[PDB]
Design a protein around this ligand. Structure first.
Ligand code: NA
Ligand code: NA
Ligand code: NA
Ligand code: NA
Ligand code: NA
Ligand code: NA
Length: 177
């Protein structure tokens, strides 16, 4: 049985004035960005969201061993994006990719809007058969997790996450308020 999605009009970066770059720089991780490009209410407090992740420089797919979204509060806690072990090949560029998955978004920003539940993206470069390309690797730390959120920052405006948190309208009711 199918249902009509309800698209959210306003998807808000909840903390655009934090310095996220610092947290990747401190770990010698190349800078990445994340945007939430669409949100649709499915039913209950479940939303289908699409993310777009970009790296500062282009890293060829050959360097990648695995990529997965972890720590997801949703129907699936893990969303495999790439991995030989898991026969999963759902992205072609670890430095410019999209993913669509479901989350349960329940923590209120206000009476009309809820926060995205935060998650991490686990990158493994140069492992397994990708280790053969080590000599041309030039982008710093090779295995790392990048986290989302607006709730973890130092006393000088640096985030201790790598990507902003986001919020949107409850049930994607664009007429709330
Ligand atoms: Na709609
Ligand atoms: Na979506
Ligand atoms: Na998966
Ligand atoms: Na809040
Ligand atoms: Na409020
Ligand atoms: Na201090």
């Amino acid at each position: 049985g199918s249902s009509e999605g309800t698209s959210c009009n306003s998807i808000v970066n909840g903390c655009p004035n934090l310095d996220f770059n610092w947290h990747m720089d401190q770990q010698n991780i190349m800078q990445y960005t994340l945007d939430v490009t669409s949100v649709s209410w499915v039913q209950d407090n479940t939303y289908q969201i699409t993310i777009h992740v970009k790296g500062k420089e282009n890293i060829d797919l050959k360097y990648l061993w695995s990529l997965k979204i972890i720590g997801v509060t949703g129907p699936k806690g893990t969303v495999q994006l790439y991995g030989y072990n898991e026969n999963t090949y759902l992205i072609d560029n670890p430095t410019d990719f999209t993913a669509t998955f479901e989350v349960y978004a329940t923590q209120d920003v206000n009476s009309c809007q809820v926060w995205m539940p935060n998650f991490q993206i686990q990158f493994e470069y140069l492992q397994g058969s990708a280790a053969q390309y080590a000599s041309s690797w030039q982008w710093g730390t090779t295995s790392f997790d990048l986290s989302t959120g607006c709730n973890n920052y130092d006393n000088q405006g640096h985030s201790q996450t790598d990507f902003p948190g986001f919020y949107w309208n409850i049930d994607c009711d664009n007429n709330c308020g």
